[PDB]
Amino acid sequence: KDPNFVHSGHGGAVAGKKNRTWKNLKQILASERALPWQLNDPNYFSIDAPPSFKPAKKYSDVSGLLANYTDPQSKLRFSTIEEFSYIRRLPSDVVTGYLALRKATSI
Amino acid sequence: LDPSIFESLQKERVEAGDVIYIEANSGAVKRQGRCDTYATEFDLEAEEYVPLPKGDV
Amino acid sequence: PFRDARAAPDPVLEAGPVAHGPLPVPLVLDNGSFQVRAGWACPGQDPGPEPRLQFRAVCARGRGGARGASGPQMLRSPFDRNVPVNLELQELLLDYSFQHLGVSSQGCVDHPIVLTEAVCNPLYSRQMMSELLFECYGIPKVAYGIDSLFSFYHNKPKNSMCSGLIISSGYQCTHVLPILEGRLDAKNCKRINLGGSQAAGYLQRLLQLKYPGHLAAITLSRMEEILHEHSYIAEDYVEELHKWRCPDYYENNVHKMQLPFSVFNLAAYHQLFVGTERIRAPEIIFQPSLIGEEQAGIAETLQYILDRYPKDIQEMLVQNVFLTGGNTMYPGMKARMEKELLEMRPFRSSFQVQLASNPVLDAWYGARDWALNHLDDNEVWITRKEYEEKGGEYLKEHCASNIYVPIRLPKQ
Amino acid sequence: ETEIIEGEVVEIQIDRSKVGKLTLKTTEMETIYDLGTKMIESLTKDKVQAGDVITIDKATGKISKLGRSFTRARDTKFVQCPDGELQKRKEVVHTVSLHEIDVINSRTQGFLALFSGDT
C-alpha cells in the first residue's frame, strides 16, 4: 500500500486541551525570537518590508477613481457629484463594509 | 551645489519632495510646486501640486 | 461569462516512471499556498514532458474520519503566509502526491526529493517539515530550495553564478530577493505580506459590496478566473484610472462577466460589470494601502533594498530584474515594472527586466533542472543519516537555497 | 487652469505645530478635509466660522468669503450655497495690455506705476 503505517507523534496536541495542529505562525515567531540571534542574522521577521514613506493616494471606494473628497457622515471617499448621490443611498451594511475593506476606524 | 545656490533654494522655501528647476550657468532656481506623489500629505494644503516631470533630469 | 473549474482528473501511475542510468531518480516537489505541483525529475529528457499533478493546495476529510479528499475535489490548507505549518493535513497532502506519482514497495518513499520552501523559512517550520519527511516518508536524501530562485535558475543562460533582483509574487507573499554571485543576500532581502490570495479576496469583497442583490452568486473560485483572465496591472495607476473616468473609454473596456442564468434578468443574473476593479486588484502588490495595509509595496521596497548597496554594485543586479510567481501572470507586468524602475535608476543608466518564460511553472521546471544537474552531488543534499546529528532545522546552502545559521532547536 | 474650492463651511476644528480639520457643503455634496499648516494659518487668520460661504484659491490659500448661507441667516450679506462639486478645475481667461506687461517689468513693484502714473 503506502510509504508508512506507524506515523510518529511529531508534536501536535495529541491529547492536550489546545488545538490539534502545531503552533500557528505567530507562536512560531514568538518562540523563534527566543533563539541566540546575532544582529546580522536572516530572521524570518526581519524580511518584512518598511512602512510606506509616501502618503498613500486617496482612491474612491465605490468606483476606484481618484478621490478629492471624504464624506463627514459615512467616511467613504469619492470623486464626483453623482458618487455622493450614490454613497448616501447605500445601506449601513456596506458602508461599514467599505471602511473595513481598507481597515479604517470601523469595528 | 555651492552654498549660494543653497541660499537660493532656501529663499525659494524648498523642501524634500518639491519639484525644482535649477540652471547651472545662471544659478537661477525656481520652485514649481510640490511633487504630486505628496498631494495626499494633507487633504487641503495651501500649495500647488505638479506631476513629476515627464522629461530628462 | 465565467467558466467553472475542473476537478477529479485520473493521473494514476505504476510503482513509478523511474528513468534509466544511475539508480536514484528524484521527485521534484513544489509547495505553495495556491498549488502543489510534483513530478519525477525525468533525467536525460531536455524538455520536462509533464510537470505532473497540477492541483490546488486545499484539502478536506469526513467528519467521521472515513475519507480524505486531498486532491482537486468547505476545505483547509496546511500553509500560513506561504510557509507550511501543519502535520495532520500536510501528511494527507504529501500522501496524495506520492500515491499518484507511484510508490515502489516498502515502508518509505523510494528515492531522493527536492522540496520547495519559503524564502526564509522559520527554523521550527523546516524542523517540523524534515521531521515529517524523515519520520513518516523516510526519503534517502532531501534538498530544500526556493520557488523564485529555482525559476531564476531555469531562466539563466548557463550553470553560472549570477546577480539580480528576483521580484517574486506567490499566493500570500511577494518578495524582492537581491542575489550576489548566486548567493541570496538574505541580510537585506525584503517581502510584502500580500499576494494573489489577498488581491482575489479584495476583488471578492469589492463585488460583494457592489452587488448585495446576490452575495451568494459570486465566489472566490470565480474571482480567481477574472483575476487571471481579464485583470491587468496599470502602466501607471493614477493615469490608467484617470482614462477610466470618462464614459466612452469605460463602456469600451468594462467587462460583461455574466453569471449563469436560470426585469432584464440582471437583478439576479448580472453581467457583473468590472471596470476599475480589473485594475485595483492587480495594484494591491504595488500599493497595498488599497487594502489599508501600511506596507511599502513592490516599488518602494525595490528602491529601499537597492539604495543600501554601493552604487557600483547596484548596476549588475538591476541588469537582471527577474519577475516570477503567480501574480506576474498579469498582462502589462513587465511594462509597469520597467516604468517603476526607470523612475528610480540614475538618469542615463541601463536596466533589464526579464519575465520568467512561464510566470509560475518555472519554479518546478527550475527545481527539475536543478535536481537533474545536482543528482549525484554529495554536499548539496541533506542525507537521511545527517538528521540524527543535525536537528532538522539544517540547510546545505546550495545555489537557489537560503542562508544557513549555525543553530540548534530545544525540543521534548 | 485654476483649482478653486467653494462651499458653505459646515464645521471647523483646530488644535496644537498645529493640526485641524474643515468641512464644506454645496447644495449637492459635503466633505471633511484635514488641513495643512498653511491652511491653518489662513482659515484662522481670516476668522472663518461655521455658516460662512467661502471660495478658496487652492494654490495660494486666499479665502474669498461671500457672506453667510441662508440656512444660517438666523443669529453680512446672505447667499445660497454654491452648486455642483466643492473643488472645481476652473478655467480663467485673462487679458493684460502690452503696456501693462512693459510696466510690471520696470520696478520692484512696477504694477503700482500702472495706477500712480510714475511710468
Curated annotation (Swiss-Prot), chain A:
Query: Where in the cell is the protein located?
Result: Nucleus
Major site of localization recorded for this protein: nucleus
- One GO biological process from the UniProt record? regulation of DNA strand elongation
Q: What does the UniProt keyword field contain?
A: DNA damage, DNA recombination, DNA repair, Nucleus, Transcription, Transcription regulation
Top-level lineage group: Eukaryota
Q: Name one GO cellular component term.
A: fibrillar center
Q: How does it assemble?
A: Component of the chromatin remodeling INO80 complex; specifically part of a complex module associated with the helicase ATP-binding and the helicase C-terminal domain of INO80. Component of some MLL1/MLL complex, at least composed of the core components KMT2A/MLL1, ASH2L, HCFC1/HCF1, WDR5 and RBBP5, as well as the facultative components BACC1, CHD8, E2F6, HSP70, INO80C, KANSL1, LAS1L, MAX, MCRS1, MGA, MYST1/MOF, PELP1, PHF20, PRP31, RING2, RUVB1/TIP49A, RUVB2/TIP49B, SENP3, TAF1, TAF4, TAF6, TAF7, TAF9 and TEX10.
Q: What does this protein do?
A: Proposed core component of the chromatin remodeling INO80 complex which is involved in transcriptional regulation, DNA replication and probably DNA repair.
Protein name as it appears in the record: INO80 complex subunit C
UniProtKB/Swiss-Prot annotation, chain B:
According to the UniProt entry, the cross-link of type Glycyl lysine isopeptide (Lys-Gly) (interchain with G-Cter in SUMO1) is at 54
Write down the superkingdom of origin: Eukaryota
Q: In which tissues is it expressed?
A: Ubiquitously expressed with high expression in heart, skeletal muscle and testis.
Glycyl lysine isopeptide (Lys-Gly) (interchain with G-Cter in SUMO2) crosslink: positions?
54
Subcellular location(s): the record lists: Nucleus matrix; Nucleus, Nucleoplasm; Cytoplasm; Membrane
The signal peptide, as residue positions, is: none
Give the misc comment.
Answer: High level of autoantibodies against RUVBL1 are detected in sera of patients with autoimmune diseases such as polymyositis/dermatomyosistis and autoimmune hepatitis.
| Family (UniProt) | Belongs to the RuvB family.
Q: What does this protein do?
A: Possesses single-stranded DNA-stimulated ATPase and ATP-dependent DNA helicase (3' to 5') activity; hexamerization is thought to be critical for ATP hydrolysis and adjacent subunits in the ring-like structure contribute to the ATPase activity. Component of the NuA4 histone acetyltransferase complex which is involved in transcriptional activation of select genes principally by acetylation of nucleosomal histones H4 and H2A. This modification may both alter nucleosome-DNA interactions and promote interaction of the modified histones with other proteins which positively regulate transcription.
Relay the domain remarks: Binding to MYC is dependent on a Myc domain essential for oncogenic activity.
Name the UniProt record assigns to this protein: RuvB-like 1
Organism field: Homo sapiens
Q: Which residues of the full protein are shown?
A: 172 to 228 of 456
UniProtKB/Swiss-Prot annotation, chain C:
Question: Keywords, A to Z?
Answer: Coiled coil, Cytoplasm, DNA damage, DNA recombination, DNA repair, Isopeptide bond, Nucleus, Transcription, Transcription regulation, Ubl conjugation
Kindly list the organism's lineage: Eukaryota, Metazoa, Chordata, Craniata, Vertebrata
Role: Proposed core component of the chromatin remodeling INO80 complex which is involved in transcriptional regulation, DNA replication and probably DNA repair. Involved in DNA double-strand break repair and UV-damage excision repair.
- What family is this protein classified in? Belongs to the actin family. ARP5 subfamily.
**Any GO BP:** regulation of DNA strand elongation
Q: Where in the cell is it found?
A: Nucleus; Cytoplasm
Identification of the protein by name: Actin-related protein 5
InterPro entries reported for this sequence: Actin (IPR004000), Actin_CS (IPR004001), ATPase_NBD (IPR043129)
Q: How does it assemble?
A: Component of the chromatin remodeling INO80 complex; specifically part of a complex module associated with the helicase ATP-binding and the helicase C-terminal domain of INO80. Interacts with DDB1. Interacts with ACTR8; the interaction is observed in asynchronous (interphase) cells but not in metaphase-arrested cells indicative for a possible dissociation of the INO80 complex in mitotic cells.
SUPFAM superfamilies for this protein: Actin-like ATPase domain
Q: What is its main location?
A: nucleus
Q: Does DNA repair show up as a keyword for this record?
A: yes
Which Pfam families does the annotation name?
Actin
Domain of life of the organism encoding this protein: Eukaryota
Q: What Gene Ontology terms describe where this protein resides (cellular component)? A: cytoplasm; Ino80 complex; nucleoplasm; nucleus
UniProtKB/Swiss-Prot annotation, chain D:
Its subcellular locations are: Nucleus matrix; Nucleus, Nucleoplasm; Cytoplasm; Membrane
The protein's predominant localisation is nucleus
What residues form the membrane-spanning segments? none
Q: Which GO molecular function annotation, any one, does this entry have?
A: ATP hydrolysis activity
Tissue specificity is:
Ubiquitously expressed. Highly expressed in testis and thymus.
- Spell out the GO cellular component terms annotated for this protein, sorted alphabetically and separated by semicolons: centrosome; ciliary basal body; cytoplasm; cytosol; dynein axonemal particle; euchromatin; extracellular exosome; Ino80 complex
Asked if the record carries the keyword Metal-binding, the reply is: no
- Key words, A-Z: Acetylation, Activator, ATP-binding, Chromatin regulator, Cytoplasm, DNA damage, DNA recombination, DNA repair, Growth regulation, Helicase, Hydrolase, Isopeptide bond, Membrane, Nucleotide-binding, Nucleus, Phosphoprotein, Transcription, Transcription regulation, Ubl conjugation
Function recorded in the entry = Possesses single-stranded DNA-stimulated ATPase and ATP-dependent DNA helicase (5' to 3') activity; hexamerization is thought to be critical for ATP hydrolysis and adjacent subunits in the ring-like structure contribute to the ATPase activity. Component of the NuA4 histone acetyltransferase complex which is involved in transcriptional activation of select genes principally by acetylation of nucleosomal histones H4 and H2A. This modification may both alter nucleosome -DNA interactions and promote interaction of the modified histones with other proteins which positively regulate transcription.
Family membership noted in the UniProt record: Belongs to the RuvB family.
Q: What is this protein called?
A: RuvB-like 2
**Source organism (scientific name):** Homo sapiens
Q: Which residues of the full protein are shown?
A: 134 to 265 of 463
